[PDB]
Each structure stands twice: as structure tokens, then as C-alpha cells.
């Protein structure tokens, strides 16, 4: 809200109001006022895009790594490994 508000305080904000009204009048009817702005380059845009994708992969990789260090996941993974180990023992016992 205070980015777009004029600087001048309330007794003196009438000067700012008539100045903006004067600019609006010069732009709509006279059209003697030129406006200038800045457009971001494609290089810095592709740099931000590359940065965002790299950080997306890093957060997801970190998130998967963090979720595998949880107690529930480690107990479940340990359980499945012990089940697969028993299956391989059944194969070993068959061979003896």
C-alpha cells in the first residue's frame, strides 16, 4: 500500500493529487508524456530458471534423504530387507 502512495503528507497531499491529475490530463488528451521502464534480459531470466530448477532438484533430493532417515521408514525398510533375506535363505536351504 505504501509503495504506491504519494510521499507528501495529508494537508499537502492535494499538491500531489493535482500533480497526478495534471500528468493524467497530459497523457490522455495531449499525449505529450513519454513513459520509460526496464525489461529484464533473457540471460538473467534463464539464470533464474536454471537456479530454480537446480534448487527444486536439491530440495526434493534432500526431502527424500530426510524421509529415509526417519524412524518409521528405517524400521519398514529394515523389515522388508529381513523378509527378502529369509526368501534368500529358503533358496540356500533348498541348495543344501
Amino acid at each position: 500500500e505504501y509503495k504506491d502512495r504519494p510521499f507528501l503528507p495529508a494537508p499537502f497531499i492535494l499538491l500531489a493529487h493535482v500533480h497526478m491529475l495534471f500528468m493524467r490530463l497530459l497523457r490522455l488528451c495531449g499525449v505529450h508524456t513519454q513513459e520509460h521502464e526496464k525489461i529484464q534480459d533473457d540471460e538473467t531470466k534463464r539464470k533464474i530458471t536454471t537456479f530454480e530448477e537446480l534448487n527444486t532438484d536439491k530440495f526434493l533430493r534432500r526431502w527424500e534423504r530426510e524421509r529415509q532417515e526417519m524412524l518409521e521408514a528405517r524400521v519398514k525398510m529394515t523389515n522388508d530387507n529381513v523378509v527378502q533375506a529369509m526368501g534368500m535363505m529358503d533358496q540356500l536351504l533348498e541348495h543344501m
Binding site: 510521499f7 507528501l8 494537508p11 493529487h17
Partner: protein
């Protein structure tokens, strides 16, 4: 970073307030971010949203103190100078409310805010009270009714100062 604009983040309330009160005496001796440099330092310090927020606070605080003084002191038989100053100030406030209504993302976004509703109550109460007094300035009863309406006005103004 957007709040402080092109100024250092270590600036406190009192430093920016003192620099606001003393522009030519506190701004050179502050490092952040010769008509070439002095003009650049003003344009950077006074383009910041924080400085505008501080200017609006101070302005609303004077408005509260001056309007409070106006309601406490007796009304004259004609429209006084302080009444004219407050009239110019509230038309300016009304124009500022119209300016924020036009350039926002709709009437609904404006009316959602509780402070905009408080602003409308402020402008409405002052104009009723002012026209009540201005209808018959020499009438004692009109002055009494006008101060009665303006009693609600001072309460809303101090409530609006909590923003």
C-alpha cells in the same frame, strides 16, 4: 528490503524520524546504498516506503492532536482558521480515499480492510459536524450539536491511529 527501499536495514525508527525532521543535517552523515549526490540522496531517502509510512503516521498524529484541540476549545461565532485547515485536510483525505479506491483491485478489496471503513466513518462524521456548525455559526445550539457529533470523530481518529 522493499520496506527500506534503497537504505541500509540497520536504520531504527528514531534515526529515520530525526533525518525526516533534520533533512540537511542528518542525511549526509548517514551511509547507505554536489547536486549530483545530494539530489540522489534525497530522491533515495524520500522514495522509500518506510519514510512515507513515517510521514503518514506523523501527519495522522498531528491531525489527532489538532482536531482534539479544536473539539476541546470553544467554537467561535464564525468559521475559525483551524476549522478551514481541518476542512482542507479532510477533503484531501477524501481525495486520497477516492485515489486508493480507483487504483486498487476492486471495491471489495478496499471495503474488506477495517481501516478503510474507519476512514469513511472519519470523513462522514467530520462533514456532518462541520455542516451542522456551518449551517448557523452564531447559533449556540448548533455549536453544542456539532461538538456532540465531533465527540464520535475524535474517538474514531484515535482508534484509526492504532493502524
Amino acid at each position: 528490503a522493499d520496506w527500506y527501499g534503497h537504505l541500509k536495514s540497520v536504520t531504527s525508527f528514531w534515526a529515520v524520524l530525526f533525518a525526516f525532521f533534520f533533512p540537511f543535517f542528518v542525511l549526509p552523515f548517514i551511509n547507505f546504498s554536489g547536486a549530483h549526490r545530494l539530489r540522489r540522496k534525497f530522491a533515495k531517502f524520500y522514495s522509500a516506503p518506510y519514510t512515507r509510512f513515517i510521514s503518514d503516521l506523523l501527519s495522522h498524529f498531528v491531525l489527532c492532536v489538532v482536531t482534539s484541540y479544536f473539539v476541546l476549545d470553544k467554537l467561535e461565532d464564525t468559521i475559525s482558521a483551524i476549522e478551514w485547515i481541518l476542512l482542507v485536510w479532510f477533503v484531501a483525505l477524501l481525495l486520497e480515499e477516492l485515489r486508493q479506491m480507483i487504483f486498487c483491485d476492486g471495491i471489495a478489496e478496499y471495503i474488506s480492510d477495517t481501516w478503510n471503513r474507519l476512514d469513511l466513518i472519519m470523513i462522514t462524521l467530520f462533514f456532518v459536524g462541520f455542516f451542522t456548525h456551518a449551517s448557523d455559526p452564531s447559533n449556540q445550539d448548533s455549536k453544542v450539536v456539532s461538538k456532540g457529533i465531533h465527540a464520535f470523530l475524535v474517538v474514531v481518529l484515535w482508534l484509526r491511529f492504532m493502524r
